[PDB]
Each structure stands twice: as C-alpha cells, then as structure tokens.
Amino acid sequence: VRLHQSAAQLVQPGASVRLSCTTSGFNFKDSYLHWVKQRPAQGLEWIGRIDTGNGNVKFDPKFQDKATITTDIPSMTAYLHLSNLTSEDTAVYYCVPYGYGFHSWGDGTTLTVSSDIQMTQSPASLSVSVGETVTITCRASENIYRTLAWYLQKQGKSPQLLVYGATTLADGVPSRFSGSGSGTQYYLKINSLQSEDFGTYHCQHFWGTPWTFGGGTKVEIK
Amino acid sequence: VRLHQSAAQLVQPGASVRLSCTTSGFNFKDSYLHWVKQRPAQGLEWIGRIDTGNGNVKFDPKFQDKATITTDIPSMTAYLHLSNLTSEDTAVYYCVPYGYGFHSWGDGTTLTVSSDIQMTQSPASLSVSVGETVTITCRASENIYRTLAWYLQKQGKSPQLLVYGATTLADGVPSRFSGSGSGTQYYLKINSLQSEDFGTYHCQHFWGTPWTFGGGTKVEIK
Amino acid sequence: FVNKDQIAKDVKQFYDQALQQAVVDDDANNAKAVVKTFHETLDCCGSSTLTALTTSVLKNNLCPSGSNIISNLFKEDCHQKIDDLFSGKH
Amino acid sequence: FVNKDQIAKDVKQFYDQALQQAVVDDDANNAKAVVKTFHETLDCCGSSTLTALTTSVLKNNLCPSGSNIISNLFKEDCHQKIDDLFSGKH
What we know:
The complex is a heterotetramer, with two copies of chain A (222 residues) and two copies of chain C (90 residues). With 222 residues, chain A is an all-beta fold. Chain A has strands spanning 4-5, 9-11, 17-22, 32-38, 44-51, 57-59, 68-72, 77-82, 91-99, 101-102, 109-113, 119-122, 125-127, 134-140, 148-153, 160-164, 168-169, 177-182, 185-190, 199-205, 217-220.
C-alpha cells in the first residue's frame, strides 16, 4: 500500500496543471521523489526530483523553467506543477520514491494537451515461445556500481519492478526471473518464459542524476 | 536462525565453568545480552547482563563475585563464567538478547553440580478443557510502561515467546493468543484453548534491571 | 507572557535532554518514562536534530508499542510533533 | 616507515571524509564510488563514530548489494573492518 497518484486531466495548449503523489509506508520526510514522463509510443524520460531533506530540486534542462516540484510533508504528498502546456506534454507522469531501497512506481497520471550516463538495452525485439529461456542485456556508459533496476511494462500499464540493485528480486516476483551483472554490464534472464510475462522490458540506472533508461526489449509470441 | 547455545556440563562442587551463547541475525555489537537461571522445579531468576556497547556488566547481588560476563564480538559470542560451583548452581541457563525489539531465548545450557519491580501472576493453576477461553493476569509493582512479555513453557523446554510489548504477537504465534494491558496491569487471553498450548505461562517486565518474572500459571486438562 | 516560539523551543530542548539521558543505559529512570510518554502522546520517535541517537533509541526500545524497527527508524520527528502541538495542527 | 596504528587511523579518517561527502546529496561522484567500494570490499556499512550519518547512508543506498535495511542498519562498522585489515584478522 505505497504510492497514490492524482486523477486524469484533459486540457488545451497554454494551460497550467498540478499532478500529485501521496506516499504512505515510506520515509517521505527525508527522501528523494522523482517524476518520470512517458510519451505515448515513446520512451521513458526523467523530469526532475526533490530531496525532501533539504528542499533541493533538480530538473532535466528541457523542463527547467516549466516544471516545478513542491511537497506537503504532513500529508506525505509530492506535487509536479507544469506551466505553458503544449502537445509534447501529452504523456503519462509517474511518481518514483527512491532512497531506503528501491520502489515500485505510481500507477501514473495521464495529462492530455489537445487543440550523464547512457543505457544500452539489447535485443530491441524478441520473438519467443512459452518455456524458452531469454537473456536481455543492459550496458551503462560508465560504472553504475550495481544501482540498476529491471521493469516489465504491459500496454497502458505502469512499469512493474522485477529486479532492483543488480540481483535482488522485488517482493512477489516469480523465482524464474534472475538479474545478474556488474560495473557496466547487466543481464536479466527469464527462465521458462510464461504467458503472463510478455511486453516491454526496461532497465534503468539510479547512479546520480539524471536517471536514464534502456531502449526497451519487446518480448512477444510468434 | 538466532541464538546458539553451548552443550551440557556435569561437574562436582568447587569447579569453574564457561557457558556460551552465539547470536547471528542480531546487532550483537551494540546490544544487551542477559543470562537467566532456571532451577529445576523452581522459577526463573535473572543473573546479569552485558551492554556490548560500553562493556558494562551488571549482576543480581547474589551472583556478584561468582558470575562473570565476557564477549567475543567478531564471532558474536557471549560467555557466562561461573566459579566456586555448588548444588544451588544446578540449573538451566538461558541466554537472552534484548534491544532492537524483543527476542526468543536460547534453547538453554544444563549445568549439573553433584557430589526492583515485583511481578504478580494470576491464577497460579488453571484446570481447563479444550475450546475454553482463559485470561491470565500480570501485575507490576510500578508502571513498567508496556515493556512486558508473555511466554509458554512446556516441560524441560525453553520458554516460547508468545507476546512482546504488551500487545504484539511474536512471529509464528497463532492469532487465538491476545495480549492486552497498560501501566501496571496486563492480561493474556487464550481464545478457544487447544491441546498444543498446555503448560506454564510466564510474564516478565524489561523495564530496567533486574528483570523479574511472574509466579507462573499452570494450564492443564482435567 | 509566554511566546509560542520560545515555549516550542523549550519543550524540544526538554525533550532532547530526556532523550540524551534515556539512551545512556538500560536503567529504568524518569528520562525513559518521559521519552516513552512523548513518543506515545505525539506518535513520534527521536528527533532529526539528534540523529546520532537513532540506533541507541532502537537499542533501548524507546519507540511506541505496535510498530516495528523500520517503522520506528522512519517514525515522525518529535520536534515537528512538538511544533504541531504548539501551533494547533495534528 | 609506516606504523600499523597510524596507517589504520588514516584509512578510517579517509573513509570518514568519503562518507561525509557521499551523504551530502544524490549526485554520483567519487566519494560514493569510494564508499560503495569500501562497503563491498570489507562487507561493512558506515561507522560507529559517524552514527549521525546512518539514516543518510540508507537514504542514499550506500550499503552493499543483497542485504535489506535492517541488515544494513546493523551491518559491521567499517572502522572495525579497517582495523581487521591492517591487523590481518578477517
């Protein structure tokens, strides 16, 4: 019973919005709350982050003046304020708490506006049949010191945390999933692939800021 | 997989012994290791304690010069050194870690030598049949601030931790067990008494030193 | 006349004193009684200003009844709970 | 000539410096790389002498891979692990 996210908002270019994220079960008071943008039919993009400890906020240069992050500590709430809205702001906004381990993202908030370490994910697409053993690869441009995560994203749903750190299986995740790797090269092996584990696999590093994602790996039955 | 205790020792009056206790899974390095004496056909008696933080040791006046406590931090081991052994030292010696919550005791070490807050447990004896609801009571001489525990002792076995604090059910303990109480009065209710929960029930406070125990409550089928 | 800010500053300091004395050893004393009371009454444990005591606070089981070590490590700061009392927020 | 006690004192101090710099923020820098290396190499996390940093150390995920928050909160002190290295105990 972690993250609670605010409802959908349909708007026109030029408007200003506030997306919200409520924690519970986390040390929200002295933590890092990040926001991740996901453009429809496009990849994951890190927006910015607040350190609720000192109140420091950081943004990806593109969101520098438009985006804003504020917190409401007693209600354990994070706010992402977006101004001068345009079509390129039409996306899903995920809230990500980070710090006393690694956490699952919020379900996401859909906003519709109508009128540095590089990750290398391999393969891009994978055509496999049930029971097969698959091995996805993620390569960082620098030593990320095993601060990586593997996620499984099913169409129109929030990325499901599979493995945190390099090797640690997230609670409730089947044993058939195995993370391995060090320094710059990491791997995710899926033993005896099943039907309920088809979609897009994403890797991510958490070694500083900005957070970056792998291209994705699309697993599908032929 | 917590406490590991040293094997039995048969000896004659005048000898000197060392009983040992190895932790694992506990912050042995900056904790409290207590030793509890249990005389055959007699009650629980607190011997003394070491604070592995500062190396301070405290003893019940009776054990002041005979007993000794030392630690081996890297192996996470506690030693109780007993000298000038006599018949009244023939007992089971339990090792009790305390500090980052409340813990189950060691299985015990049998030593055989052959040639302040007062607790009030009620009732002393209880003759009941399966399915009955029982309510044991423990009264402290002073406010013990809910730092109490309920244990179930089955013949020739180490006291099994049922409830810690006043109300908290120890992991693996059936739901049918319920601790309640505050300030000076505490209670343990056993809902729908079963066969596997017959024996002696003990209460204990952990509000400072020395640790003291209730008279015991013997539950039996008639 | 007692000022909101001065009274809030003193309760926090009185608390800091109590917590400093409570973690020294396992001896049942008033400081522990006082710390256990503040923690229960305000639903908090330790202070941000006295982070050097957190482990000691856990070691002495000074946080309220019911919550585990992780909940108590991440429990609400007592200085903040003291501020909310004197300002009427809760 | 390098004395056992002086060298052990300096590695501990070098470590303390690194840990102090590492907890300041979430920025990937050498101090974090150095702290993450010491922790992994010696199988430890933080120091007893720098208890005021433990929560911050956890907040920045600076303890080794595999172990949870409780294991890391109660992990072996790095100053002791440094002492064992220079004295040949392990």
